[PDB]
Design a protein around this ligand. Structure first.
Ligand SMILES: [Cl-]
Ligand SMILES: [Cl-]
Length: 101
């Protein structure tokens, strides 16, 4: 039952992440991509209404990952944490997997 995650898109451009997410029906649909403007950093792109919001994946000194305050030993834990705690300080948006073709 071991499957790869449906949310890791590697190095897709910010704009293509917006393109792909715009077609998703449900708020919270998201992906992790490897930033092109900041190589070696990740970004989290999320559908909300007619918009796609982007969040920097930030790192502490020890290489933990975070968006705001709570930090995680992995992108995988950061993603899962934010399935039930909002990614946004403006709306209640919870990560949910893309509907896959
Ligand atoms: Cl919350
Ligand atoms: Cl979920």
């Amino acid at each position: 039952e071991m499957k790869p995650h449906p949310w890791f898109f590697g190095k897709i451009p910010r704009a293509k992440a917006e393109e792909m997410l715009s077609k998703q029906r449900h708020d919270g649909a998201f992906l992790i991509r490897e930033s092109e403007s900041a190589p070696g950093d990740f970004s989290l792109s999320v559908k909300f209404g007619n918009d796609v919001q982007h969040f920097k994946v930030l790192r502490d000194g020890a290489g933990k990952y975070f968006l705001w305050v709570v930090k995680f030993n992995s992108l995988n834990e950061l993603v899962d944490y934010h399935r039930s705690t909002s990614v946004s300080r403006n709306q209640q948006i919870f990560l949910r997997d893309i509907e896959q073709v």
